[PDB]
Amino acid sequence: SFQTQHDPRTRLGATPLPGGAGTRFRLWTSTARTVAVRVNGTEHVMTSLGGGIYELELPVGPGARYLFVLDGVPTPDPYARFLPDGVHGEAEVVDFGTFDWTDADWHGIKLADCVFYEVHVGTFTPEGTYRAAAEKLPYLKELGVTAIQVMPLAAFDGQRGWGYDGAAFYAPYAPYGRPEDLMALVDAAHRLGLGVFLDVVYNHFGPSGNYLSSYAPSYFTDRFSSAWGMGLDYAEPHMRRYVTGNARMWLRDYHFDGLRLDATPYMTDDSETHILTELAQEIHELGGTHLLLAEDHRNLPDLVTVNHLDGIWTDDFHHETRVTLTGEQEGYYAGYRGGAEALAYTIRRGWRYEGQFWAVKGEEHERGHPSDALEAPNFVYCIQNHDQIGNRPLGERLHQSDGVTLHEYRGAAALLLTLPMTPLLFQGQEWAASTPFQFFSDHAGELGQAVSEGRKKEFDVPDPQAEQTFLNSKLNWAEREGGEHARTLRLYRDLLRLRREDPVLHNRQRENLTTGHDGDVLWVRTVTGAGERVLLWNLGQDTRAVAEVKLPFTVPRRLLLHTEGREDLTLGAGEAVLVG
Numbered sequence: 001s002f003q004t005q006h007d008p009r010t011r012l013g014a015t016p017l018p019g020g021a022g023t024r025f026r027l028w029t030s031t032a033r034t035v036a037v038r039v040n041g042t043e044h045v046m047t048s049l050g051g052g053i054y055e056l057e058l059p060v061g062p063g064a065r066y067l068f069v070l071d072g073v074p075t076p077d078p079y080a081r082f083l084p085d086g087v088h089g090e091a092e093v094v095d096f097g098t099f100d101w102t103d104a105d106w107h108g109i110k111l112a113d114c115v116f117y118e119v120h121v122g123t124f125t126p127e128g129t130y131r132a133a134a135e136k137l138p139y140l141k142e143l144g145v146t147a148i149q150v151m152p153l154a155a156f157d158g159q160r161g162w163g164y165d166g167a168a169f170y171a172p173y174a175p176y177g178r179p180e181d182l183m184a185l186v187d188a189a190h191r192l193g194l195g196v197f198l199d200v201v202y203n204h205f206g207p208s209g210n211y212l213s214s215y216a217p218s219y220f221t222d223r224f225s226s227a228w229g230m231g232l233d234y235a236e237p238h239m240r241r242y243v244t245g246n247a248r249m250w251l252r253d254y255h256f257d258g259l260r261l262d263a264t265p266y267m268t269d270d271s272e273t274h275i276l277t278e279l280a281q282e283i284h285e286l287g288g289t290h291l292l293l294a295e296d297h298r299n300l301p302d303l304v305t306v307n308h309l310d311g312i313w314t315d316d317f318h319h320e321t322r323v324t325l326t327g328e329q330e331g332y333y334a335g336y337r338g339g340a341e342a343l344a345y346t347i348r349r350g351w352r353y354e355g356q357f358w359a360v361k362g363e364e365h366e367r368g369h370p371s372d373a374l375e376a377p378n379f380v381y382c383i384q385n386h387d388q389i390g391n392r393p394l395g396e397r398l399h400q401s402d403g404v405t406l407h408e409y410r411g412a413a414a415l416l417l418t419l420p421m422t423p424l425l426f427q428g429q430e431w432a433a434s435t436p437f438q439f440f441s442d443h444a445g446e447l448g449q450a451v452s453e454g455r456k457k458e459f460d461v462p463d464p465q466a467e468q469t470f471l472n473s474k475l476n477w478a479e480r481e482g483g484e485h486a487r488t489l490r491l492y493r494d495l496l497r498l499r500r501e502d503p504v505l506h507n508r509q510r511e512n513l514t515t516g517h518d519g520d521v522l523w524v525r526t527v528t529g530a531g532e533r534v535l536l537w538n539l540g541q542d543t544r545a546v547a548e549v550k551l552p553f554t555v556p557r558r559l560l561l562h563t564e565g566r567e568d569l570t571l572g573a574g575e576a577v578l579v580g
């Protein structure tokens with residue numbers, strides 16, 4: 001008996017009317033004295049309904065261009081469904097009913113069946129568009145991933161960016177393609193049996209192109225701040241509905257299978273029903289199988305068990321893994337020792353910090369909560385993602401950091417892709433891509449100069465505002481065809497096939513997973529009614545024979561996959577083997 005707060009009749013923005021009658025325009029403003037809509041260059045005064053709600057119906061159809069006029073000031077629509085001329089321009093009226101979907105036989109994907117592949121549309125292909133990305137779907141299907149995780153698509157200012165400066169949350173970023181190009185990408189993924197997830201940013205708006213305060217300052221609060229401006233006030237129902245209505249658009253109207261909520265610790269809300277719970281209620285009301293994931297660092301199971309989200313991006317595994325391979329200790333890496341015994345513990349517990357003191361300077365507190373309630377799929381693990389590559393001064397990938405060998409990189413892949421936790425790969429990871437993933441942006445004027453200055457001061461560091469920084473992050477597909485890139489790719493294909501086919505690796509219960517170590521050798525054991533598997537990873541500098549690893553059980557005898565393709569059960573430095 002939860003009832004959605006959304007009715008298409010009363011939807012804010014521009015919505016096509018039935019019977020070819022045109023478009024209904026609606027907005028909420030708490031402060032404007034005169035309110036008009038300017039459509040195809042002609043102004044029309046809107047009707048005041050009370051509660052700051054204004055409405056007008058006109059016989060203009062999909063394709064019409066408009067903005068609102070508040071006290072005589074032309075102002076973009078925050079509810080724009082498309083912004084062909086960017087975030088300071090006129091919106092286009094969009095009709096979600098026109099696209100010819102062919103994915104009636106697709107029914108979503110369960111979290112336990114996800115292997116995520118994180119795509120940044122602008123760099124994933126030379127063209128940097130949805131249409132070019134769609135052409136790589138057969139490659140991704142054959143690779144063996146099952147869910148694409150797309151970085152944010154809400155329109156932001158400039159001609160490239162990661163997506164976290166999105167300002168018009170309902171408008172797909174025009175350089176990537178039109179709305180129908182996005183729909184075509186999702187339809188094609190579904191036809192190949194791939195899920196598609198979207199990164200959405202409900203903790204802040206980007207610095208340029210967010211006109212919500214022009215309509216009502218009370219969308220935001222001065223009680224707390226974001227990176228870019230005033231905090232999003234989830235005590236204000238119109239602010240709540242701005243993001244729940246957005247989540248429903250992406251899932252229902254663009255057929256996304258799930259959302260990854262960026263930076264959930266910073267969605268501050270003291271309401272009786274937290275906004276994260278209401279988001280889950282609103283998306284479930286759609287009557288589908290859509291998922292919600294939280295990017296959350298607090299090691300807080302309540303995100304799943306109270307807010308009814310599906311899982312959590314949990315970085316302790318990533319960090320413990322990177323420290324193991326590099327020894328680095330700057331910033332949050334100081335929270336981890338790394339090593340076989342440390343990795344065995346972190347995996348055992350799902351995350352490391354369950355309430356113990358986090359001693360990282362500038363951040364000291366008792367971090368986290370007991371992970372007992374969470375099951376393996378609820379933890380999303382990775383060894384690379386946009387942040388853990390791009391937030392490094394030179395944006396280098398794990399195999400490109402000093403002191404990491406390709407053998408260690410390949411071992412890490414075997415550990416990630418045989419665990420029952422839900423794994424994510426970053427684009428190009430699978431072939432040990434040669435290109436970095438650097439932070440890039442393209443803001444105008446003083447804001448752009450400020451970004452360049454901020455990056456220099458924070459940490460030669462590539463200028464985020466330079467075209468070269470964007471181009472240097474483009475994937476080079478041809479390189480995957482040769483050398484160590486091809487060798488790494490063969491291993492990723494083999495691991496993803498094993499994950500799919502092996503009846504014991506199908507395990508998704510932490511009850512069936514144990515871990516331990518002997519010196520620098522990590523072991524991870526799965527036992528179910530289908531049999532036993534053990535992953536052994538030699539994190540030492542020497543060679544270790546499997547026969548000589550001290551284990552509290554009898555090691556399985558059959559060699560299922562060796563990361564360097566060896567015939568015998570021996571582990572060179574950094575190498576791993578799966579036995580059964």
Ligand SMILES: OC[C@H]1O[C@H](O[C@H]2O[C@H](CO)[C@@H](O)[C@H](O)[C@H]2O)[C@H](O)[C@@H](O)[C@@H]1O
Nearest residue numbers: 300301302303305306369370371372373
């Ligand atoms: O303060 C947040 C919540 O903390 C507790 O819940 C966590 O810790 C419990 C054991 O201490 C676990 O059983 C639970 O799964 C964790 O989320 C507290 O029990 C909750 O009521 C609080 O909301």
Ligand SMILES: OC[C@H]1O[C@H](O[C@H]2O[C@H](CO)[C@@H](O)[C@H](O)[C@H]2O)[C@H](O)[C@@H](O)[C@@H]1O
Nearest residue numbers: 322323324325326327328337338339340
């Ligand atoms: O060599 C001095 C450092 O030794 C330890 O760090 C190494 O060993 C860890 C496993 O115990 C690895 O995870 C790490 O990558 C290695 O650098 C020690 O933890 C450090 O404090 C010492 O500086």
Ligand SMILES: OC[C@H]1O[C@@H](O)[C@H](O)[C@@H](O)[C@@H]1O
Nearest residue numbers: 297315316319331332360363
């Ligand atoms: O992964 C742990 C880290 O999560 C980060 O994203 C937080 O911003 C940081 O303060 C913390 O150290």
Ligand SMILES: [Mg+2]
Nearest residue numbers: 518519520550
């Ligand atoms: Mg020993």
